[PDB]
């Protein structure tokens, strides 16, 4: 496993390390959206920061299941439940949860 840049938005040199992680914080309980990204490993985007995506770049075709492990780095007193979903082909970006 290598770090996936889900937060690939900032681009100025001083803020590059920020791409390495996304935030979560107290919401208003409406099952709000936290983040989204394509699962395509050999496509431009987040996966480009991973060794998998890079090596994948040397092969025309690939086949297999992928996995993403999310690590929470908040304080020990913080708690929470998240819903992470993978939407197979054909499904548009989910409107709501």
């Amino acid at each position: 496993e290598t770090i996936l840049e889900v937060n690939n938005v900032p681009t100025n040199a001083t803020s590059l390390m920020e791409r390495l992680r996304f935030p979560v914080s107290a919401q208003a309980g409406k099952g709000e959206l936290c983040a989204v990204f394509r699962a395509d490993p050999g496509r431009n985007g987040p996966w480009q920061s991973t060794l998998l995506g890079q090596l994948c770049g040397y092969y025309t075709q690939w086949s297999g299941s992928l996995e993403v492990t999310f690590m929470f780095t908040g304080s020990f007193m913080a708690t929470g439940k998240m819903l992470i979903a993978y939407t197979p082909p054909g499904g548009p970006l989910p409107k709501d949860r």
């Binding site: 919401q27 959206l33 086949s63 929470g80």
Partner: protein, 48 residues
């Protein structure tokens, strides 16, 4: 896509914002085929 199932709850004295780090890799049924050059070529002029 990631959604808040419930909510990020914290007591008095703890930060209202924390971060998540995502690590990814392939499962053991993963394989690749047909070697090709990568789309990037990290060089603009000649390398001295």
């Amino acid at each position: 896509s990631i959604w808040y199932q419930t909510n990020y709850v914290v007591p008095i004295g703890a930060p209202n914002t924390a971060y998540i780090i995502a690590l990814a890799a392939a499962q053991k049924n993963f394989t690749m085929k047909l070697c090709k050059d990568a789309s990037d070529i990290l060089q603009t002029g000649t390398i001295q």
